[PDB]
Amino acid sequence: GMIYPYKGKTPQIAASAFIADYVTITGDVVIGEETSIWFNTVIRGDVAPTVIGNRVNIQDNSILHQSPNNPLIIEDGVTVGHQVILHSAIVRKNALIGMGSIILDRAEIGEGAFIGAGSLVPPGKKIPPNTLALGRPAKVVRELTEDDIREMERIRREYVEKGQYYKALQQ
Amino acid sequence: GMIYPYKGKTPQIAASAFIADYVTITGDVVIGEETSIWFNTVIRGDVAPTVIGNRVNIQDNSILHQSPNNPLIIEDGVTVGHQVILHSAIVRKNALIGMGSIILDRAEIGEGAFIGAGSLVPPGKKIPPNTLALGRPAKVVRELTEDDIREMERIRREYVEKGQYYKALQQ
Amino acid sequence: GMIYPYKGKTPQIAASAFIADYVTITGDVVIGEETSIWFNTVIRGDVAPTVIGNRVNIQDNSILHQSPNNPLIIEDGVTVGHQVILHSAIVRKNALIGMGSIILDRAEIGEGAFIGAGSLVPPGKKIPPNTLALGRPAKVVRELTEDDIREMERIRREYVEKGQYYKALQQ
Ligand SMILES: [Mg+2]
Ligand SMILES: [Mg+2]
Ligand SMILES: [Mg+2]
Numbered sequence: 001g002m003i004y005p006y007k008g009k010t011p012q013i014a015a016s017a018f019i020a021d022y023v024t025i026t027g028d029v030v031i032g033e034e035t036s037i038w039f040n041t042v043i044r045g046d047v048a049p050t051v052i053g054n055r056v057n058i059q060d061n062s063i064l065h066q067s068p069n070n071p072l073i074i075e076d077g078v079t080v081g082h083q084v085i086l087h088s089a090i091v092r093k094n095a096l097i098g099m100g101s102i103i104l105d106r107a108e109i110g111e112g113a114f115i116g117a118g119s120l121v122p123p124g125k126k127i128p129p130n131t132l133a134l135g136r137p138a139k140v141v142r143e144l145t146e147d148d149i150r151e152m153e154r155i156r157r158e159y160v161e162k163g164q165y166y167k168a169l170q171q
Numbered sequence: 172g173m174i175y176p177y178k179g180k181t182p183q184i185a186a187s188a189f190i191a192d193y194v195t196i197t198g199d200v201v202i203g204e205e206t207s208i209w210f211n212t213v214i215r216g217d218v219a220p221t222v223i224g225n226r227v228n229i230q231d232n233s234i235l236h237q238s239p240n241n242p243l244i245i246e247d248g249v250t251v252g253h254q255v256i257l258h259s260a261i262v263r264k265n266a267l268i269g270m271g272s273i274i275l276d277r278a279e280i281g282e283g284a285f286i287g288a289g290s291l292v293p294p295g296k297k298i299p300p301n302t303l304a305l306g307r308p309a310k311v312v313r314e315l316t317e318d319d320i321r322e323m324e325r326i327r328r329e330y331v332e333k334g335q336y337y338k339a340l341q342q
Numbered sequence: 343g344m345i346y347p348y349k350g351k352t353p354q355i356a357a358s359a360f361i362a363d364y365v366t367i368t369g370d371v372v373i374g375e376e377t378s379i380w381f382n383t384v385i386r387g388d389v390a391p392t393v394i395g396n397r398v399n400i401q402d403n404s405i406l407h408q409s410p411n412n413p414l415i416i417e418d419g420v421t422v423g424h425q426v427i428l429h430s431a432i433v434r435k436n437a438l439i440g441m442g443s444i445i446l447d448r449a450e451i452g453e454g455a456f457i458g459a460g461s462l463v464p465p466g467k468k469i470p471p472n473t474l475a476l477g478r479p480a481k482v483v484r485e486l487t488e489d490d491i492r493e494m495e496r497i498r499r500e501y502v503e504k505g506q507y508y509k510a511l512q513q
Contacts, residue, residue: 002363002381004511021173022193022211022364024381024402026508039195039213040232040364042381042402042424046504060213060234061382063402063424063441082213082234082256085425085442099234100256100273100291102442102460118273118291118307120442120460136307136460136478162217166197169175192344193364193382210344210366210384211403231384231405253405253427270405271427271444271462289444289462289478307478333388337368340346 001025006046014054018163032056032076036163048072048088057159059099062086067105079156081117089121092129096152101138114144114152177217185225189334192341203227203247207334216243219259224249228330230270233257238276248327252288260292263300267323272309285315285323343367348388356396360505360512374398374418378505387414390430395420399501401441404428409447421498423459431463434471438494443480456486456494 001019003011006027013019013029018036027045031037032054039060043050048066053076058064061083066072070088074080078091081099089103092110097103098117107121115121116134127133131140132148172190174182177198184190189207196208198216203225208214212233214221219237224247229235232254237243241259245251249262252270260274263281268274269288278292281300286292291307298304302311303319343361345353348369355361355371360378367379369387374396379385381402385392390408395418400406403425408414412430416422420433423441431445434452439445440459449463452471457463462478469475473482474490486494 004508006507021195022382024363039215040193040211040382040403044381044402060215060236061211061232061403065402065424082236082258083254083425087424087441099258104459117275165177166175192366210386211364211382231386231407232382232403253407253429254425270429288446336348337346 006044009045011043011045016164018167020060020166034160034163036159036166038062038082045072053078053093055156055160056080057156057163059084070105075111077156079152079159094152094156096155098134112144112149112152114148177215180216182216187335189338189341191337205331205334207330207337209233219243224264226327226331227251228327228334230255241276246282250323250326250330265323265327266300267326283315283320283323285319351387353385353387358506360509362402362508363512376502376505378501378508380404380424390414395435397498397502398422399498399505401426412447417453419498421494421501436494436498438497454486454491454494456490 002024004026009028011025011029013031014033016034020039022040025043029045029050031052035056041062043064049071052074056078059082064086066088074091075093077094079096085102088105090108094112095109097115100118102120105123107125109127110129112130113127114132119134119138120136121138131143133140173195175197180199182196182200184202185204187204191210193211196214200216200221202223206227209231214235220242223245227249229251230253234256237259244261246264248265250267256273259276261279266280266284272290274292276294278296280298283301284298285303287305290309293308304311344366346368351370353367353371355373356375358376362381364382367385371387371392373394377398379400383404385406392414394416398420401424406428408430416433417435419436422439427444430447432450436454437451439457442460444462447465449467454472455469456474458476461480463480
């Protein structure tokens with residue numbers, strides 16, 4: 001793993017966090033408790049602040065960055081799939097970002113919302129809490145069911161465990 | 172090059188296989204002879220079985236993973252383009268996956284099929300063998316001319332050559 | 343950072359160029375003065391020549407490659423966003439390729455053109471200089487305003503400086 005400062009700012013990573021290999025984190029970045037950053041993921045906090053909560057999982061090959069004056073916020077329990085681009089996005093508690101998705105500047109993903117795989121959420125777009133949105137540009141296609149919420153809950157719990165397991169293996 | 176075991180399962184890589192730098196391979200994964208896994212690709216076998224045939228090429232920055240109970244099967248001679256996401260997908264012999272595509276769960280890609288760049292094959296979708304499928308979601312547009320099929324044999328064979336060449340350089 | 347020669351040709355990189363960690367560059371590749379190749383980017387020059395001008399920035403997780411007899415050309419001042427796939431593209435002076443885009447074989451991006459995020463420019467497609475192209479397939483929708491051009495100027499100016507800043511930390 002690579003850690004780099006930027007103009008006097010360095011990442012603040014919880015001790016329980018898992019930082020996979022070939023990951024790069026730089027600048028003004030805060031990573032919460034039990035959160036896991038998977039393989040080859042890049043997080044450059046050299047434009048605006050980046051705050052990632054607890055028990056969050058940033059899956060493999062993702063890119064997190066920002067545009068001027070637009071902080072990147074990822075609250076507790078969030079799941080972000082493989083190869084996702086988060087650019088100054090605001091991702092509220094428990095949301096899930098489908099793999100291969102691009103979440104643009106100031107777009108706000110509602111609490112518990114689910115973004116389908118391969119979607120593009122345009123600048124400033126707000127996705128209502130607990131809904132399913134997908135497409136390019138992403139549109140809400142329906143609100144979530146209790147079965148969807150159960151699986152989202154299962155996914156983030158699973159990843160907390162996998163992160164701890166891989167963290168151990170890193171010996 | 173990073174190899175990790177996962178819960179009792181450890182990657183089994185053929186001797187003639189080329190595993191590029193910054194590649195990560197974990198758990199229940201099996202890689203065949205003469206296949207090449209290119210730069211930054213991530214293959215996490217921690218959800219379900221992953222089997223990769225012989226003479227296969229998985230190009231740069233790809234992500235291979237699985238959903239529960241859905242193995243990831245990639246038969247012989249398959250060409251996986253740059254930065255592709257394969258999730259519990261079943262790719263039949265000699266098929267070609269265009270760069271930037273996303274093949275989702277239980278989606279089966281028929282033998283000799285050609286998935287156009289930037290495509291997204293939805294969960295459970297079956298793609299007829301010997302056909303060309305494009306779009307998001309991918310739709311079959313036509314059949315492959317003998318010329319197409321020969322360009323695929325040319326690519327497939329070419330990557331076995333490059334695979335062994337870079338493998339030599341590595342050493 | 344990995345630097346590999348290919349079939350007797352080794353990458354020629356200006357001394358002022360910044361090459362981030364986990365970057366892989368091989369073969370027939372020329373990188374100009376002060377350009378910055380960001381984290382996890384892959385530049386494989388093993389099929390056709392690749393020439394990258396000066397003060398260019400290739401952002402994190404991008405992949406540059408070619409098709410037979412189709413050189414990959416990127417002139418001075420070009421900005422290519424995160425996770426971009428450039429395959430035998432001809433990118434003219436000062437153009438900007440939005441993050442998550444796929445620019446295909448023989449496609450040419452006119453001087454100062456701006457490709458919107460997540461776009462796909464099909465093979466052979468030509469984008470007029472100083473225009474905004476969006477979508478998949480991408481389509482020209484309008485012309486760039488005066489401060490759109492001003493912003494583009496600001497962008498490549500910061501990356502030239504940011505690359506030099508990170509370059510120093512690297513040492
Ligand atoms: Mg950026
Ligand atoms: Mg997965
Ligand atoms: Mg290629």
